[PDB]
Amino acid sequence: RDEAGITGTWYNQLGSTFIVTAGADGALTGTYESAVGNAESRYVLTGRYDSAPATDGSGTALGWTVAWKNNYRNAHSATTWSGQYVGGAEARINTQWLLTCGTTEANAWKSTLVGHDTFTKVK
């Protein structure tokens, strides 16, 4: 259980901030602030993590979603990050993400961006 390991403030390579609380059940709840894109200030995030990982040195699977609507902006889109928390002295959250925009069925073929974010506790 990496409840304490995961809970807190994280930073990615683009300068975004991810603030999360991990529940004893597997819940993730928090806020995301993006350094890039059609976004300003904090956005709600919710997700899930494996609260009883293997003890064989494997990482801890986790994922979360941000819908890019808050009181300031609505970018009609949602990103999900899927990845794993790895602990120890250079602790990291390594993810791949999918960002889907709401589109017309005509433009659905260009609705989805794919990328990868590495989060750390420092920067």
Next chain:
Amino acid sequence: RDEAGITGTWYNQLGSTFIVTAGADGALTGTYESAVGNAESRYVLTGRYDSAPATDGSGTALGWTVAWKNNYRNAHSATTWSGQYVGGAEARINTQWLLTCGTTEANAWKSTLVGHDTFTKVK
């Protein structure tokens, strides 16, 4: 707002069942039962959707996460679906997903599956 449109029971092409409640804020909460993989019975899911989409015929962006641990099994993994709800008489949720397994850093390059699921209200 597709709060009522989204809320309810959905089925995908593999025979999985997705049961969700959409909140007025943008919350998604529910259960997922997979027809395939290292899974049995219901798993908690949580996510987010755009509660005020464009009115120009575009779909409604949304996403959610399942961590594949419940009282019966723990597959040390998590899937996130990112997509859009499209309403009208053949209503669909069209998604792409990322499934990450917890791995050793040696095997991280083979940690993540990518696929696509279409959900409908019928089948």
Next chain:
Amino acid sequence: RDEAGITGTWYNQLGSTFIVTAGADGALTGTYESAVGNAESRYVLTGRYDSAPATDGSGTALGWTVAWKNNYRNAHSATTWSGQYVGGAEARINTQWLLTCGTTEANAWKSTLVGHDTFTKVK
């Protein structure tokens, strides 16, 4: 060996045409015409396929790339499709694709679209 199975003209769900010749070695060469996007007429494609698949009913892995430059347009981008050929009476090529645009390092986080195309011999 699905050299003859693969060689010929294929159509996807968006109305694109994929014309390919499969070599005895594993080569794929041909042309792609996209029904959507910043594209007109034929574009060169090249790729690879598994020329000696398993005989246990598994599909045949394959992939190919189009750079979206020809004599008519240059969209400064490239799509790769990765997938498998499945034979028999409703023969299909099932793929997922990544389309990368050339970008500034500032915009690299939004350089890559992900999707899925199903090709058939008819439509």
Next chain:
Amino acid sequence: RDEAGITGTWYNQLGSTFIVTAGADGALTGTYESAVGNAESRYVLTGRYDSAPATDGSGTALGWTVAWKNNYRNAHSATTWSGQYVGGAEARINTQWLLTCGTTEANAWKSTLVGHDTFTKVK
């Protein structure tokens, strides 16, 4: 045109070697040796790149495919890398990839791995 920029030997974060020749037309041809997975020695690769990129500081889109069959092994699979070449003193090829295995239609939902590789001229 980054024909000379691209042509040569490249190394990724996993210790793989990518040896490529870029043609004046847009062709890529070469060999790939993987440091990980069900692979040994060199595998043919073929692909495409944008031979006349924008001059506005954007990268050069490119992609290529390896089918994992050679004289030593056949892993019934194919990887495609889609990405962009960025020049200058720390020159990089930044990619995302899809690796599809041939599967039964029953197991198609778990056929495809997604990842990201950064290649450099040194290491």
